[PDB]
């Protein structure tokens, strides 16, 4: 559970926003890419796993589950790649709500940024710092510190 | 001191590697860019501050310290922007040794990656997970969790 993340891919402005959610805290990292390829997904997971202790990734669709590039990054970084089948139907709901929240935030900041990539990083920052009480960024650090001790 | 980071810019392969170091832990984040501009530095700091609780950044040179785009990102993300004067001369030596270690790691992985940006992310991963005892990635989570508590 400290080590489990879920990938999620959403679209805006003709572009793709790739998101990784830390399931137990709701903390996220995200990037904008032109399209969702196994090479972009693989690089994104290499980045994530150098920054947090990623033990398991639930991939966002069958193409990234199948992709040998994605499997090669998960091998390199020590990540167990799994499917993203919502055996718990609560999962679909939580992701859909997160995409709608993020798109809302992105529209609230959208006029402060020329490029979408900026607005998306502003929305990561707002999402992770929002107190709902602790923020997601506080929860993920507490969860992992608890695990290390 | 849980909130204090230092920017560091190093060169390799005619390209620029921008690094942020969390001073109390040695944990790092890094990216490859074609050249160091205020806009690239500003975007990298927006990214860092959406991911960790960044209170103060010691800028890597006077042009990023002066840059109004870098100041606008620090204002946006709530970061106090400071100079990087090594009033402690040990600061100089710590950064030089970090750059030489990162470059060594990058040379050890360099033929597993077509692009330098992959090799740099592999080096971030190896650096942050290296046990020296705890890793940098363990230390930064412990430090921050202790602060939150």
């Amino acid at each position: 559970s400290p080590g489990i993340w879920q990938l999620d891919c959403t679209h805006l402005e003709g572009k793709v926003i790739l998101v990784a959610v830390h399931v137990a805290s709701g903390y996220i990292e995200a990037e904008v890419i032109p399209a969702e390829t196994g090479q972009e997904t693989a690089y994104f997971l290499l980045k994530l796993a150098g920054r947090w202790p990623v033990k398991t990734v639930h991939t966002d669709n069958g193409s990234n589950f199948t992709s040998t590039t994605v499997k090669a990054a998960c091998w390199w970084a020590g990540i167990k790649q799994e499917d993203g089948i919502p055996y718990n139907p609560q999962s679909q709901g939580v992701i859909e709500s997160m995409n709608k929240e993020l798109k809302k935030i992105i529209g609230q900041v959208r006029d402060q940024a020329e490029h979408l990539k900026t607005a998306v990083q502003m929305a990561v920052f707002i999402h992770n710092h929002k107190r709902k009480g602790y923020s997601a960024g506080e929860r993920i650090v507490d969860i992992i510190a608890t695990d290390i001790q | 001191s849980p909130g204090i980071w230092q920017l560091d810019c190093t060169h390799l392969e005619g390209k620029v590697i921008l690094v942020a170091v969390h001073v109390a832990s040695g944990y790092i984040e890094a990216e490859v860019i074609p050249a160091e501009t205020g806009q690239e530095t500003a975007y990298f700091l927006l990214k860092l501050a959406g991911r960790w609780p960044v209170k103060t950044v010691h800028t890597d040179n006077g042009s990023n310290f002066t840059s109004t785009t870098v100041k606008a990102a620090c204002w946006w993300a709530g970061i106090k922007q400071e100079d990087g004067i090594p009033y402690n001369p040990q600061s100089q030596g710590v950064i030089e040794s970090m750059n030489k270690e990162l470059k060594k790691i990058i040379g050890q992985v360099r033929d597993q990656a077509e692009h330098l940006k992959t090799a740099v992310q592999m080096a971030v991963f190896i650096h942050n997970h290296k046990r020296k005892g705890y890793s940098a990635g363990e230390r930064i989570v412990d430090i921050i969790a202790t602060d939150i508590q």
Binding site: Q39, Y43, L46, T69, A72, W76 | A113, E114, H115, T118
Partner: peptide
């Protein structure tokens, strides 16, 4: 290309 980022 026989690389992690270019398996070709």
């Amino acid at each position: 290309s026989r690389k992690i980022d270019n398996l070709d």
